[PDB]
């Protein structure tokens, strides 16, 4: 009933911290995201992850990083984690220069494409808008 944790390493965790966006996108600065990235760096490292943080990534750079991350040798890791902090819309996330489908980023880690993570948990934490609807809430 439990994923095997008996590995040399808990695993790698990559954080994409997007704060500043090219004027062409029309997107504002994401103030507070640095605090997010720093708090996440500490929590995840405390759990046992090897964490690395990349700031203000273009779409191409996010793509290359996640692809490259999937091509690392995870044989001696129990799992893998990716954290994305950025603006977003439905099904997509902003690099500094525009939007990229979230599914394209995660595709590199599919069982047939990333063998050393096969049968291991692949975790994606995604802080981004997914559309413009607002929850007005309701009182009991």
């Amino acid at each position: 009933y439990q994923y095997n944790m008996n590995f040399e390493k808990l695993g790698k965790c990559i954080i994409i911290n997007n704060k500043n966006f090219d004027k062409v996108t029309g997107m504002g600065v994401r103030n507070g995201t640095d605090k997010d990235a720093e708090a996440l760096f500490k929590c995840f490292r405390s759990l046992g992850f090897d964490v690395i943080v990349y700031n203000d990534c273009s779409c191409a750079k996010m793509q290359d990083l996640l692809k490259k991350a999937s091509e690392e040798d995870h044989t001696n890791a129990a799992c893998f984690a990716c954290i994305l902090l950025s603006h977003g819309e439905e099904n997509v996330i902003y690099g500094k220069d525009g939007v990229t489908p979230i599914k394209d980023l995660t595709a590199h880690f599919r069982g047939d494409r990333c063998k050393t993570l096969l049968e291991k948990p692949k975790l994606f934490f995604i802080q981004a808008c997914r559309g413009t609807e607002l929850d007005d809430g309701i009182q009991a």
Partner: protein, 153 residues
């Protein structure tokens, strides 16, 4: 080494005293984390000039590359740490290093408009014709960002 690890963290956080202490105690200056980043990588990236310099004097590999082939000079050039860039160059950092993503220090520096950094890189023989993944040189990048001063140089 636990000491190699403590040195890595001391260097990222900018703990000057802690860094010197670990060195005197025999900590590996070329200690490596799981992403292939060295104390020099972490100090260079986070603007810790005095830590960069103490590491350098203790024979840190100035051209150590991490998991995506980035050197401490790449990281310093990107973040605009002028004095760190110079310290690295003075210790023989490869001014024309390509990382695995097609970045050069010059092109990184050009992108963010770091004029003084560009000038230092040029002085150390940076290839002005180097192309990024999209075929752009430092000059192409300077125009697209509207940096008229950088375009002049």
């Amino acid at each position: 080494s636990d000491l190699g690890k403590k040195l890595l963290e001391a260097a990222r956080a900018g703990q000057d005293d802690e860094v010197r202490i670990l060195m005197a105690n025999g900590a590996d200056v070329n200690a490596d984390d799981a992403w292939g980043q060295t104390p020099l990588h972490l100090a260079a990236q986070n603007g810790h000039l005095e830590i960069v310099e103490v590491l350098l004097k203790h024979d840190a590999d100035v051209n150590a590359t991490d998991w995506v082939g980035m050197t401490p000079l790449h990281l310093a050039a990107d973040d605009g740490h002028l004095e760190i860039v110079e310290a690295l160059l003075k210790y023989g950092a490869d001014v024309n290093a390509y990382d695995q993503l097609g970045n050069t220090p010059l092109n990184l520096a050009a992108t963010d408009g770091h004029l003084e950094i560009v000038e230092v890189l040029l002085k150390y023989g940076a290839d002005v014709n180097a192309q990024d993944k999209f075929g752009k040189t430092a000059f192409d990048i300077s125009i697209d960002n509207g940096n008229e001063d950088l375009a002049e140089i």
